């Protein structure tokens, strides 16, 4: 189908923003160990909100890309509106670049005044640093996009893949609405904050990832749509059965009742299962490929995604998800280690997987790129992925020493925050070096086009 | 074991746990007044929350262990810096003197806050420090 070409600006933009996100990571990584680097021009928190908002916005673009490419194909017809896809692309891209500029060009509190945040205070919460008007703009874009892809599913062939995608996509946009809710009570504010972050990333985003993976395996594997869709249901069932009460693993120490200690730990202990199932899924259905496929990078991206998501989300998540352990590790470098590997392994990787399948055939090159381009893509996969394991190990070692020095001893014997950080310097230099190998990997990946 | 079976499990399981979760949320909501000592949640503390937000303190600091990991945990800072009685006075000096300008040291910005705003900030952090948090953090260092 011809209207699948609208997916292209989304994937290209996503990749540009991905580059920005890395540059800003590298800035903060240096700030950790040369603490006045770029100060006061770009203080750490400014570099941070750019790094973390560019991560979310680029994945959101990837998701829209992915939906624009596969939804027409699933529905067996043209997309409801190629021209709407294009208006929305420019509005979303313009709003994203404008708000980044906001963060970079006007001190934060000045940005708050200027966007009239005091009428409706949503600013200055983690991952939610965008002006309220800028959040509103993002809702309007999400509503547009949902109508577009949703109308396509309506007049069109329904499949379980497309309907689980639409469910995740709708749930994503609904849950975002909690970012307009800023309670005056700190505990209450934190309680509903996680309805955005956790119910996205261990809930509704899992439906999006699983559906993208499912579609890619239908196309690359020639295994039966029926068997694929059954597992897809098993996987999202386990995601929501573990993950909805599992939200409680963020409710240990924020000021809500101690029953969450039990509920949070027991249900989140099971949240690895759907990532484990996605590994059995992709390995088993690639082993049973009734046909061979010209683009051997897509298959690597798909197996790679599931292993890294399972390591980053399942294994590193489990490591700290039990309350008696989390008590010591909460808000520590161990958190940053898990957050990086989980976000990369599940979400960055699935976006690059769908791009790897869809790019050649959006550019009308064929199913695959030539053999020189395919070795580059693979080189960029291994460089980025190995670097990210090293980022995770170095921060994990830093997290262990942090907990040992700062968190375990008694008052008097425990080391102070700032003194501990100096003891962690070495792990931070290593993380920074790993971060450099990652950017190189991203360059190698990009030069594969 | 069929597609149809898997889909019904997905359906039943999501609805059940969705309802369980809202039931827990309703209950938890009713306990917050006591756990958080909401009686004390003064106009001063609520304006302090705005100051915290508007200057993105959480972009460098953790509070109750959430936020950024560049700078210290501010949930119990009141215990490392003059306690109940002298903490407001400490905070006024602390905000005025930034940045410390130690070569190579992690730097905090000058926010040019008024004394009213810093006092609201102090009341907010003092109040935060008293939330029943199930004994988190492990010690006075946060």
């Amino acid at each position: 189908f011809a209207s699948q070409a609208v997916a292209k600006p989304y994937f290209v933009f996503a990749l540009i923003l991905f580059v920005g996100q890395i540059l800003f990571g590298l800035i903060m990584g240096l700030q950790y160990v040369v603490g006045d680097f770029l100060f006061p021009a770009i203080p750490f928190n400014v570099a941070r909100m750019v790094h973390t908002n560019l991560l979310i916005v680029w994945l959101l673009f990837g998701f829209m890309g992915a939906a624009y490419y596969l939804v027409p194909e699933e529905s067996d017809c043209e997309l409801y509106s190629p021209k709407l896809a294009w208006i929305l692309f420019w509005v979303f891209a313009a709003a994203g670049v404008l708000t980044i500029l906001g963060y970079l060009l006007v001190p934060y509190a000045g940005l708050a005044r200027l966007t009239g945040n005091e009428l409706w205070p949503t600013m200055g919460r983690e991952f939610l640093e965008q002006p309220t008007i800028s959040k509103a703009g993002i809702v309007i874009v999400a509503l547009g996009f949902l109508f577009n892809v949703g109308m396509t599913v309506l007049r069109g062939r329904k499949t379980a893949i497309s309907m689980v995608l639409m469910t995740g996509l709708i749930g994503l946009a609904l849950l975002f609405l909690f970012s307009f809710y800023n309670p005056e009570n700190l505990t209450r504010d934190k309680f509903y904050w996680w309805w955005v972050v956790h119910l996205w990333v261990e809930g509704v985003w899992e439906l999006i990832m699983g559906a993208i993976l499912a579609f890619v395996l239908v196309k690359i594997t020639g295994v039966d749509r029926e068997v694929i869709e059954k597992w897809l249901y098993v996987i999202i069932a386990m995601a929501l059965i573990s993950g909805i009460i599992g939200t409680g693993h963020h409710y240990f120490w924020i000021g809500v009742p101690g029953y969450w200690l039990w509920l949070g730990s027991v249900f989140s202990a099971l949240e690895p299962l759907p990532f484990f199932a996605m590994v059995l899924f992709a390995f088993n259905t690639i082993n049973r490929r009734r046909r061979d496929y010209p683009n051997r990078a897509v298959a690597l991206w798909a197996m790679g995604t599931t292993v890294m998501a399972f390591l980053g989300a399942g294994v590193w998540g489990f490591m700290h998800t039990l309350a008696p352990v989390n008590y010591y590790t909460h808000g520590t470098q161990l958190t940053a280690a898990h957050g990086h590997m989980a976000f990369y392994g599940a979400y960055a990787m699935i976006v690059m997987t769908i791009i790897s399948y869809a790019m050649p055939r959006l550019r009308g090159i064929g199913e695959a790129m030539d053999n020189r381009s395919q070795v580059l893509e693979m080189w960029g996969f291994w460089l980025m992925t190995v670097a990210m394991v090293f980022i995770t190990l170095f921060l994990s070692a830093a997290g262990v020493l942090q907990v040992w020095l700062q968190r375990m001893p008694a008052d008097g014997a425990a080391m102070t925050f700032m003194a501990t950080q100096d003891q962690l310097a070495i792990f931070y230099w290593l993380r920074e070096g790993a971060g450099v190998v990652f950017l190189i990997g991203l360059v190698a990946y990009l030069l594969s086009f | 074991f069929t597609k149809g079976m898997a889909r019904n499990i997905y359906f039943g399981g999501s609805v059940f746990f969705i309802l369980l979760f809202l039931a827990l949320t309703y209950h938890t909501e009713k306990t917050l007044p006591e756990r958080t000592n909401e009686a004390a949640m003064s106009a001063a503390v609520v304006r302090g929350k705005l100051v915290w937000e508007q200057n993105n303190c959480v972009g460098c600091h953790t509070l109750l262990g959430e936020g950024a990991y560049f700078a210290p945990e501010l949930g119990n800072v009141v215990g490392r810096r003059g306690g109940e009685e002298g903490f407001n006075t400490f905070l006024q000096a602390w905000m005025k003197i930034q940045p410390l300008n130690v070569p190579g040291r992690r730097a905090m910005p000058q926010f040019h806050l008024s004394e009213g705003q810093v006092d609201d900030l102090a009341e907010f952090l003092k109040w935060s420090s008293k939330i029943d948090t199930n004994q988190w953090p492990p010690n006075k260092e946060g």
Partner: antibody
Amino acid sequence: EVQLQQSGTVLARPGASVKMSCKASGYSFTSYWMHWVKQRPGQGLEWIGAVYPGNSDTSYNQKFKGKAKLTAVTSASTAYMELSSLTNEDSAVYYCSRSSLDGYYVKNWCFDVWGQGTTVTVSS
Amino acid sequence: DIQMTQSPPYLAASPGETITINCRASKSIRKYLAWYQEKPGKTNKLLIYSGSTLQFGIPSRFSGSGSGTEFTLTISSLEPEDFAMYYCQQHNEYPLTFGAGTKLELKR
């Protein structure tokens, strides 16, 4: 309350050695450089060196490399200075004091708490 | 090593008046100059660091300024407890070094 308690007056013969202590309380002992400073009557303060109890590293004024040895014992939150091969010029008050800032890389800073001083009197 | 020279070595003054004393470094110490108060029977007390930052709990009647090579300490309206010995110390480089002091005495 951050406090530093120094040991009492010591008397020694020329060429002998003396060792004095500084007991820290009220703060994270392993997180701050502990400095030592010499004051001879009518003579102005001199910085001898510092020890960082979080990793045992030490730093010495070149004028005191021969003279002073600095150590710390973590469990007791106490720092020590040993002065050797004593001379009349080592008769002085010796102070320990805490960096006003925590961490390893603030070696050269100012101090916020001082001990009350230990007198060393070198005589035959 | 940076040598520090304080002048004057003695200054007599009265309650209610303002005084200002000097500290000179032999080379630039950027802005990193601290001051201490010494009194009989008490431990030495940090007053100011980094040239002009008041230490926590120090009354605002004390202030200081300077950079590079030349620095001052001012007390705005002397109080009886302010008559004391005052030392400056550079905190820009190894080895740390101190001036020898200004003694502020009570005029009668």
